[PDB]
Amino acid sequence: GASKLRAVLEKLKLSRDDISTAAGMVKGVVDHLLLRLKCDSAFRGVGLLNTGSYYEHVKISAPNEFDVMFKLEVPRIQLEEYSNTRAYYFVKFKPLSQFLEGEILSASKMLSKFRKIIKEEINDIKDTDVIMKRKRAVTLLISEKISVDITLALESKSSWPASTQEGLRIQNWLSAKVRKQLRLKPFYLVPKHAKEFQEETWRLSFSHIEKEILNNHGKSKTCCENKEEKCCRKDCLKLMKYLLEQLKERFKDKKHLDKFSSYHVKTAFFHVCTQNPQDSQWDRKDLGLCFDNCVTYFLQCLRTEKLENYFIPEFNLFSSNLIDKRSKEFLTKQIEYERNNEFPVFDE
Numbered sequence: 321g322a323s324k325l326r327a328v329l330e331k332l333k334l335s336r337d338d339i340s341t342a343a344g345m346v347k348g349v350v351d352h353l354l355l356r357l358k359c360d361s362a363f364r365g366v367g368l369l370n371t372g373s374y375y376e377h378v379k380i381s382a383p384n385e386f387d388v389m390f391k392l393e394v395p396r397i398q399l400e401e402y403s404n405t406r407a408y409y410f411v412k413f414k415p416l417s418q419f420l421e422g423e424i425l426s427a428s429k430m431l432s433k434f435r436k437i438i439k440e441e442i443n444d445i446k447d448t449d450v451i452m453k454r455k456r457a458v459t460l461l462i463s464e465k466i467s468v469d470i471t472l473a474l475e476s477k478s479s480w481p482a483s484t485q486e487g488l489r490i491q492n493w494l495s496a497k498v499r500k501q502l503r504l505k506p507f508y509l510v511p512k513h514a515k516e517f518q519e520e521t522w523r524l525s526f527s528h529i530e531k532e533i534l535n536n537h538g539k540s541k542t543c544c545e546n547k548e549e550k551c552c553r554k555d556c557l558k559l560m561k562y563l564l565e566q567l568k569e570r571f572k573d574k575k576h577l578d579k580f581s582s583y584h585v586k587t588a589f590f591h592v593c594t595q596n597p598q599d600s601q602w603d604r605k606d607l608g609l610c611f612d613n614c615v616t617y618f619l620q621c622l623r624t625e626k627l628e629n630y631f632i633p634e635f636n637l638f639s640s641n642l643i644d645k646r647s648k649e650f651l652t653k654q655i656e657y658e659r660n661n662e663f664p665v666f667d668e
């Protein structure tokens with residue numbers, strides 16, 4: 321039974337126009353900020369990284385909340401893996417000379433200048449109302465409705481770090497040909513500190529590869545281009561994302577589900593895609609059965625405390641050090657109740 325699932329997808333489709341207009345406001349303000357940022361010597365090669373839920377056509381809800389990524393090409397860089405983390409690194413070289421705190425590029429000094437130019441650029445913009453919310457990377461408020469989370473990401477056209485070597489298991493699904501082509505693409509580093517925290521580390525980002533895989537997702541090149549070749553991959557991800565957002569909303573006044581994100585759902589989704597490489601395993605008629613494997617796999621990750629990063633196999637997103645067992649058990653309790661009662665949180 322996919323009735324309640326198909327119902328939700330129709331309601332989610334109704335949010336498309338509001339999200340689209342709101343994205344229009346954000347594209348306006350962001351194109352402006354990038355024009356002003358490009359003036360500074362350090363942020364010369366700055367550009368918009370067209371990655372995220374919106375460009376991947378999976379932005380389910382919240383038109384008043386957008387995340388934007390700013391790429392900055394860095395020339396010949398050297399990475400030093402921090403404390404065997406496989407995801408966190410120090411950026412060494414091998415225009416950013418001003419931000420070097422030794423031989424290591426400072427995340428803090430880099431972000432400070434970024435925050436400084438952005439702060440300076442939002443007072444000069446009078447056309448639309450734009451306010452900047454203080455740091456607690458950079459958050460804007462367009463008109464007085466839309467919030468924009470702005471992330472800075474370094475771009476490296478180098479070969480991917482060794483920790484990714486056994487990641488991106490798309491060979492039997494998307495082909496080895498595609499895996500070779502994808503790994504030839506750059507890789508990003510977002511400033512994220514790691515526990516000790518180490519406020520000088522950078523985390524690996526493959527937002528662009530997630531987009532490529534989501535927007536060209538079948539074994540067949542003509543997947544979702546004809547009546548006979550329609551699949552339910554994207555619809556399963558949209559439903560998983562919506563399941564977490566609804567439960568997170570239902571229990572906001574509890575605080576358990578705070579540490580869970582759409583990235584956990586997306587990672588689990590790519591794992592299920594690897595397990596079911598055939599387009600025939602994703603038939604539109606089988607949506608109920610397909611979403612049930614997604615729910616089921618996700619629950620196994622919660623129980624076993626094992627959700628490996630799709631690109632970095634050794635990095636566990638569901639580690640006890642990141643999410644406490646009692647929180648995973650609450651999320652399990654709720655998802656199982658929902659599945660058992662024909663998803664009451666959907667019509668909610």
Ligand SMILES: CNC(=O)c1cnn2c(O)cc(-c3ccccc3)nc12
Nearest residue numbers: 407524525526527581583629632635
């Ligand atoms: C909770 N995670 C997120 O919200 C989130 C969003 N993008 N992204 C991402 O591009 C990478 C990772 C990540 C987190 C830990 C270790 C390895 C990779 N996380 C994210």
Ligand SMILES: [Zn+2]
Nearest residue numbers: 538543544551
């Ligand atoms: Zn498809």
